[PDB]
Each structure stands twice: as C-alpha cells, then as structure tokens.
Design an enzyme around this catalytic site. Sequence first.
Site, mmCIF file in Angstrom:
data_model
loop_
_atom_site.group_PDB
_atom_site.id
_atom_site.type_symbol
_atom_site.label_atom_id
_atom_site.label_comp_id
_atom_site.label_asym_id
_atom_site.label_seq_id
_atom_site.Cartn_x
_atom_site.Cartn_y
_atom_site.Cartn_z
ATOM 1 N N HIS A 144 0.822 -1.234 0.000
ATOM 2 C CA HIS A 144 0.000 0.000 0.000
ATOM 3 C C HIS A 144 0.853 1.279 0.000
ATOM 4 O O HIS A 144 0.241 2.320 -0.237
ATOM 5 C CB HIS A 144 -1.118 -0.002 1.054
ATOM 6 N N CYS A 171 2.733 1.695 9.707
ATOM 7 C CA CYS A 171 2.662 0.591 8.716
ATOM 8 C C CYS A 171 4.102 0.193 8.354
ATOM 9 O O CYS A 171 4.987 1.108 8.292
ATOM 10 C CB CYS A 171 1.814 0.942 7.516
ATOM 11 N N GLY A 190 1.362 6.139 10.291
ATOM 12 C CA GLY A 190 2.814 6.149 9.991
ATOM 13 C C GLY A 190 3.449 4.858 10.476
ATOM 14 O O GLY A 190 4.638 4.647 10.235
HETATM 15 O O1 LIG Z 1 -5.570 1.331 8.677
HETATM 16 C C1 LIG Z 1 -4.909 1.914 7.886
HETATM 17 C C2 LIG Z 1 -3.412 2.316 8.086
HETATM 18 N N1 LIG Z 1 -3.143 2.249 9.499
HETATM 19 N N2 LIG Z 1 -2.587 1.211 10.082
HETATM 20 N N3 LIG Z 1 -2.521 1.415 11.401
HETATM 21 C C3 LIG Z 1 -3.108 2.587 11.691
HETATM 22 C C4 LIG Z 1 -3.264 3.246 12.908
HETATM 23 C C5 LIG Z 1 -3.912 4.437 12.851
HETATM 24 C C6 LIG Z 1 -4.327 5.007 11.631
HETATM 25 C C7 LIG Z 1 -4.181 4.393 10.410
HETATM 26 C C8 LIG Z 1 -3.486 3.161 10.453
HETATM 27 N N4 LIG Z 1 -5.486 2.227 6.654
HETATM 28 C C9 LIG Z 1 -6.880 2.007 6.422
HETATM 29 C C10 LIG Z 1 -7.147 1.075 5.252
HETATM 30 C C11 LIG Z 1 -7.916 1.444 3.945
HETATM 31 C C12 LIG Z 1 -8.050 0.328 3.079
HETATM 32 S S1 LIG Z 1 -7.215 -0.938 3.912
HETATM 33 C C13 LIG Z 1 -6.690 -0.261 5.276
HETATM 34 C C14 LIG Z 1 -4.772 2.998 5.607
HETATM 35 C C15 LIG Z 1 -5.172 4.292 5.447
HETATM 36 C C16 LIG Z 1 -4.566 5.097 4.457
HETATM 37 C C17 LIG Z 1 -3.547 4.514 3.686
HETATM 38 C C18 LIG Z 1 -2.903 5.359 2.626
HETATM 39 C C19 LIG Z 1 -2.303 4.824 1.514
HETATM 40 N N5 LIG Z 1 -1.828 5.843 0.809
HETATM 41 N N6 LIG Z 1 -2.142 6.996 1.469
HETATM 42 C C20 LIG Z 1 -2.804 6.710 2.584
HETATM 43 C C21 LIG Z 1 -3.146 3.159 3.866
HETATM 44 C C22 LIG Z 1 -3.784 2.406 4.878
#
Ligand SMILES: O=C(Cn1nnc2ccccc21)N(Cc1ccsc1)c1ccc(-c2cn[nH]c2)cc1
Lengths: 306, 306
Positions: B41, B145, B143
């Site tokens: 991602h 991930c 941040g």
């Molecule tokens: O859940 C996430 C990423 N993530 N992981 N741990 C988190 C703890 C607090 C906040 C966000 C957090 N997602 C949500 C998603 C949506 C479809 S599958 C999973 C996520 C959100 C935004 C991105 C993104 C990619 N490019 N820009 C932003 C990726 C994962």
Amino acid sequence: SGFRKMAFPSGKVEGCMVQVTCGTTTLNGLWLDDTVYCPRHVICTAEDMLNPNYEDLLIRKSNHSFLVQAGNVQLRVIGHSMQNCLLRLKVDTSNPKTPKYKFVRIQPGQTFSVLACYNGSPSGVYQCAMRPNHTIKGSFLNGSCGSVGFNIDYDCVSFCYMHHMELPTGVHAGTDLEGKFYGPFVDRQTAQAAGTDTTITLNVLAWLYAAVINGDRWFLNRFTTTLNDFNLVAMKYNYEPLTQDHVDILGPLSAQTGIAVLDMCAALKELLQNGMNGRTILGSTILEDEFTPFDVVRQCSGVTFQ
Amino acid sequence: SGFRKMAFPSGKVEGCMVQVTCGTTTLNGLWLDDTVYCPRHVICTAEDMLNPNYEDLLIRKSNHSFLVQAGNVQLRVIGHSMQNCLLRLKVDTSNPKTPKYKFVRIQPGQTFSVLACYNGSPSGVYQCAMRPNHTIKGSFLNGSCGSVGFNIDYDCVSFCYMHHMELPTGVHAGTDLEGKFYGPFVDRQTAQAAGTDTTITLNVLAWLYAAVINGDRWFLNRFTTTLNDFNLVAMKYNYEPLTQDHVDILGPLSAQTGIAVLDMCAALKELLQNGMNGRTILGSTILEDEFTPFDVVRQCSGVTFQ
Ligand SMILES: O=C(Cn1nnc2ccccc21)N(Cc1ccsc1)c1ccc(-c2cn[nH]c2)cc1
Ligand SMILES: O=C(Cn1nnc2ccccc21)N(Cc1ccsc1)c1ccc(-c2cn[nH]c2)cc1
C-alpha cells in the site's frame, strides 16, 4: 488507536551489558566508555551478605580479582573503586557501542524500561513504575542483579536504575547509577520490608485522559470538585493526595480533551465511590496507575477522537 | 519472582528498520541482506485505497519511484517485485547489521514482540498475542505501517508480522513476511470487521501454572473434570474448547507443579463459575490469556515456590 505498557527500544542498552565475576559470584555490569558499573555485592560470598563490611571486603581485592566478559571478549580490569552501593571497574577498552547517555535519579511515580539480563545477555524488556514505597513490581530471577532501567529521549539514554535485591513480598529494590538506593533499603541481610504503598493519583488521571483521547467518555459526569473534597475521598481509597503541582502537570492533556482537571477529578471520585459497574476503560477493569502524563502524550494521538 | 508482559530485546530488529517513500507516501521497511520489505500500500494514494489494482499501480513505477532511507543514508533501489501484500525492493547495499533470521507464520494464540516504528525510527516495544480472530490489540498511529513483530531464540530473529491496517474497532491487522494476511482481511477499503473473538484457554491454564510456580495456590480445589465437562463450561464463558493436544502441551508445567492438567481445568471451571471473590492472581483481578506455556517456562523459575 490502542494503548499498551510500551518500553523504549532496548538496542542502545543491549550494547552496554557485560558479565562481571569475582570468585564464584557472577552478575551483570553496564559498560560505558572505559567504566563498568555493577552492584558492590558481587564481592560478597552468600555468608558475607549477613553482615558485610564492603570497605574491608574490597581492600582485600586486586584489579585481577575481577573478570569482565563483553560477549566473547575478556576486558582487562585496570582500576576499581566503590561509589555508594556500586563498584566502578576501569577497563583497558572503551565500549565502541557507548550511546549518548546521562545518569538520572527518577522520582516516585515515574516510569522506566527494564532490560532484564543474565550472565551479561539481555533476556527481556518491560516497563516499570517506581512505586511511592520506592520498589518496582519487576520480574527477576537469581542472576538478574546489575540489570538496568532507563528512558530514551532523542537517542540519549537516561539510565536511572540498577537491580540489587528482591524483598520478601517479591518486589524489587535497587540503586541509581551513583549507587544510592531508592528507598530505605540496604545491600545486607536485615528484616527490611516494602513499606505500605499508595495508588499514583496523577497517573490514574493521565490514563483517564488517554481513554478520552482514544474516544471513550462513559465515566465522565456533570460534577466538579475542590482539591480538598477530592483528597478526602483519595485518603479513603489509599490514593496519593492531589496537589496543585499535579493539576498544573495535567494542563496539556486537559487542553487536548477540553476536560478541566477538577472535572476529571470529579469523574475519578465517582469511579472510586461507585466502581466501573462491569465496564472497562482502555481494556482494563481496574484503574491503571503505571502511566505518567508524559507516557500518555508519547503514545496517544495528538488528535482527540471527538 | 514477579510476572510481567515481557518483550524480546529489540536491538537486532532496530538495526533493520528503514523508511520507504513512494511519491507523498512514507512508511517503514525491514532491511535484511540486500532486500527491503514493506506493505504494498506504499504505492497507493489515499484515493487508490478505495479500489486499488496493485498489479496495475505497480507496473507504472520504476526502481527510482522508490526512496529508501537507512538512518542518514540513501539506499539505491535496483529492483522491485510484489509478493502477496508486500513489496520487495532490492537495494545496492547489504545491511551490515542483518541478524540471523527466519520468516515464520505464527498460529492463533501465539505471542510476539512488536517494535512500533515511525519514519524508519523505532519508538517502542511491547508484547502482543495473535487473537483467535487473527487481530492483535496493538498500539499504532498513522505512519506505523511496516512495523514488525518477532520472536528471538538463541540470537535468531523469527519475524512473524508486518503491520498493514487498523480496523474500525481499533485492533490491528497485518501479514507474515511472505505478505499473506493473518485472517480474512484485505489491503483495500471494504466493510471488513474483526470477527467475534474467544479467550485463549491454553494460555489461561499456562498462567494459572505460572501463579503456582510463583507460590500461590488459593484457586486450586479438590475436584477433577473430563475434557467434555470442561468444554461445556468453556462454551458458556466464550473460551476455546480444550483439546487433548492442549493437555499434552501443558505436561511440563503440570510436572513442575505436580498439578494434573484436568485438576487445573477443574480450578479454572470453579473460577469461571464463582469469580475471584475480590482476590488476585499474579496481581490481576481477571484471568490473563496473553501468555503461552512457552512464555511461562521462559520467564518463571524452574523451581516451584512450594
Ligand atoms: O488502517 C490503515 C493504516 N493504518 N494502520 N494502522 C493505523 C493506525 C492508525 C491510523 C491508520 C493506520 N489504513 C486504512 C485502510 C484502507 C483500506 S485498507 C486499510 C490505511 C489508510 C490510508 C492509507 C494510505 C495509503 N496511501 N495513502 C494513505 C493506507 C492504509
Ligand atoms: O535479593 C537478592 C538478589 N536478588 N535480586 N533479585 C532476585 C530475584 C530472585 C532471587 C534473588 C534475587 N539477594 C538477597 C539479599 C541479602 C542481603 S541484601 C539482598 C541476594 C542474595 C544473595 C546474594 C549473594 C551474594 N553473593 N552470593 C550470593 C546477593 C543478593
């Protein structure tokens, strides 16, 4: 989201642990620059511990009475002195992995990371509060003496604890890195015991703020309290009195949540009087006191889930 | 004595964390030999996440679409491929700090250490169980991930988790280091939710054994149970059924304490039916399930306090 008892990453401390042997006795030392720090009880036999005279036990040792093992490597001892309840060994080699560091004496209610070590090899890391009675609820076995506590801030390691003893109740006692004991404890056999303890009120309030930052308000109420009225309740429940200094420290968490500190106190009073009625806060059925206001700001989002 | 949620020392993993940037998006990667592993991602914009086609997003990237930062140092990307939900970047430099390592897929109910990281910089370490519903109750912010989970055994790091997602309930989902998700989750926007969870029965029994090794027997009773009779109670209390394989795994803890596994089951049944009557076990008011039988043997004395 989430909220965990989080330790600092332990790498910078791992590269400082060594083994110190004097005769039959082995325990852990901390190798910074060309000095190794360890508990002075390394110089005692089991029977010496009943009534040791450290000054008289130490003058009978040479530099070569001490073996220091850094991984596979023998470090030659070229000097020794006692500083309070620590021994300082000067060695022939400066630790190439010495981090930026300071020695600090932490205050009661403050938290640190413990790197449990045996035979100079790190085995585990967990977070501890210094209890008001100057003990820590650690996890330590025989051989753990000289294991250290620390905090990290921007790549500077603040060492604050060295492990010396397990008390009869199973809690732990040690020194700062100047070899001064936390609490009234001594490195010899006595009837010494952990004094009565108290719940760290400031930390409970920080952790209620954490719960609101993470999105939960179930325990809030429409009431306020004076500091005096709060403290009458605190004493009933074996909580540390809240002071104006503690209210001031909670200012940033109060600002981020828009909940006045004494409004949060009113919530805590109600939880102490009524219990949690089978509910949880951040996954807990009990009021948690091992997170400081600094620990909450470090781990929680700077944006409240409103 | 004592019993703490203990993580492995994190040094060997700290020396492997880097930052990976693709356009506007930064997250964490794991640098072993001349490969960097990170969530796929990283190649998506926020809007891409609604319905990404990773095959079609990736073919539009070159090697130089990717920036990898190891501390102060820029690593040149010279190759890339997707493996399930991971990207693998080949870089021009082998990580001199690469530990002895393996990639393992952990099973539900097993534990590991998480090194939370932001911008390639490790911030904290804590221990997690893999829940039966394939989530972890972590502590993660935006941040985080590409933060990894691991276990260490004799200086070999067993990497088992890479962080991808926070679910709507605030629990966390990710992949093994082959990029296969734990559980039914996907790296795109859907109505996905944590399935119902269960209490890890084997871990509760291990932790009762821990309490006896550390000297406490208050909760034992003169009763025994069949596996069948135990499981009727387990189902009532949303506990995983106990199997003969789970009884076999508890053999060494049973031997060290002299308490037959089904005699310990009888104790657990009584605790589920009657509660703890205001008492604690190893400091807890509740039955703990995030310690495996391996975690108990690792941390407890090999000598029972009889
Ligand atoms: O859940 C996430 C990423 N993530 N992981 N741990 C988190 C703890 C607090 C906040 C966000 C957090 N997602 C949500 C998603 C949506 C479809 S599958 C999973 C996520 C959100 C935004 C991105 C993104 C990619 N490019 N820009 C932003 C990726 C994962
Ligand atoms: O408490 C300790 C050492 N210690 N620290 N953490 C422990 C966890 C489990 C078991 C023992 C542990 N003591 C007891 C003592 C006695 C007077 S002051 C403190 C201890 C016991 C033996 C020695 C010893 C010195 N030379 N040989 C044995 C030192 C400390």
